[PDB]
Curated annotation (Swiss-Prot):
A divalent metal cation 2 binds at residue 116. Interacts with RAF1. The interaction promotes RAF1 activity. Transmembrane segments: none annotated. One of its GO terms (cellular component) is cytosol. The chain holds residues 482 to 819 of 829 of the full protein. This is High affinity cAMP-specific and IBMX-insensitive 3',5'-cyclic phosphodiesterase 8A. Composed of a C-terminal catalytic domain containing two putative divalent metal sites and an N-terminal regulatory domain. A divalent metal cation 1 binds at residues 79, 115-116, 245. The gene is PDE8A.
Length: 338
């Protein structure tokens, strides 16, 4: 409620794609997640759905944010606040509003919030090659994603005042828990193309086939019916969280550049440590002594971003994101200056 003015201002237009997430970071003194989380969850009326008090929610957001490492250049609570913001923006789209159910929305906003909790600023490959405790605990399989989901539930249900799921019916909770877990696990990149291709094959292609019959009222129900199956809602949710997770290149140029700097430094640090410990270098190209951040971003965009957002845009209609992506791609291209 009574939020210090500067923070209240930094959160004024959070429903718009162009949002100064870094001013939120500065204003909140590296606590953007609890503040943006509170406003978003309220706007979506989540406790009124889970039957929790703003007090229980505040405690929950506090312990989650506290478990995001501020020392990480990229994977700190600001990244999650940002992903939370993109998630809300997507949930607010007509196509998504008329396809997903309130419980899916709840799962999505919560998944975004916790999807990277306690991230160590190192990739799964690093943890595995290092024989890290987490890698041994998760048998070198989806190591970090499994950890993010697991730790989040441990912190949530391990203390009564943090458990935002306390007042739920076992069944509804079970359904919500499975949905949250699925979205968090869907952020593991090794499965990137699998998730994207399934979205294209089960959603965009079939839908395009139906949108030929015309705007028949009897045709709409056919579409509405097809896109609302539990299977497709799951694929849509997976696509939604994945796109929110790597939406940096679709942000206003100033922000896009800052995110590239942050993730680059995080990757550079890992490379320096790998060569030090003698561990195998998993990201040979990501060395601070030889890597061009602009060329790397261009490759990243061309390899993953372009096709995934093409499909997401085709399904949801996201002209703002696509225009920024083009402008940003051009910006990186324009830096060659040689
Ligand atoms: Mg992650
Ligand atoms: Zn993430």
């Amino acid at each position: 409620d009574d939020v210090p003015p500067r923070i209240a201002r930094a959160m004024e237009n959070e429903e718009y794609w162009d949002f100064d997430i870094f001013e939120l970071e500065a204003a909140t003194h590296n606590r953007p997640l609890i503040y943006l989380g509170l406003k978003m969850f309220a706007r979506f009326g989540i406790c009124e759905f889970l039957h929790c008090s703003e007090s229980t929610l505040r405690s929950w957001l506090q312990i989650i944010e506290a478990n995001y490492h501020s020392s990480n250049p990229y994977h700190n609570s600001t990244h999650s606040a940002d992903v939370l913001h993109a998630t809300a923006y997507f949930l607010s789209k007509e196509r998504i509003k008329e396809t997903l159910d309130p419980i899916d929305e709840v799962a999505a906003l919560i998944a975004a919030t916790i999807h990277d909790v306690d991230h160590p600023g190192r990739t799964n490959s690093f943890l595995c090659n290092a024989g890290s405790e987490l890698a041994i605990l998760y048998n070198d399989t989806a190591v970090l994603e499994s950890h993010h989901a697991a730790l989040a539930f441990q912190l949530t249900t391990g203390d009564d005042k943090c458990n935002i799921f306390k007042n739920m019916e076992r069944n509804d909770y079970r359904t919500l828990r499975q949905g949250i877990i699925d979205m968090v696990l869907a952020t593991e990149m090794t499965k990137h193309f699998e998730h994207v291709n399934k979205f294209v094959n089960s959603i965009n292609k079939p839908l395009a086939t139906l949108e030929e019959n015309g705007e028949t009222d009897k045709n709409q129900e056919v579409i509405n019916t097809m896109l609302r199956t539990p299977e497709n809602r799951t694929l849509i949710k997976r696509m939604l969280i994945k796109c929110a997770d790597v939406s940096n290149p679709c942000r206003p140029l100033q922000y896009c550049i800052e995110w590239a700097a942050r993730i680059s430094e995080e990757y550079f640090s890992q490379t320096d440590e790998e060569k030090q410990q003698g561990l195998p270098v998993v990201m040979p190209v990501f060395d601070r002594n030889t890597c061009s951040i602009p060329k790397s971003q261009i490759s990243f965009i061309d390899y993953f971003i372009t096709d995934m957002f093409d499909a997401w845009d085709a399904f949801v209609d996201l002209p703002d994101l696509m225009q920024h992506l083009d402008n940003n791609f051009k910006y990186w291209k324009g830096l060659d200056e040689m």
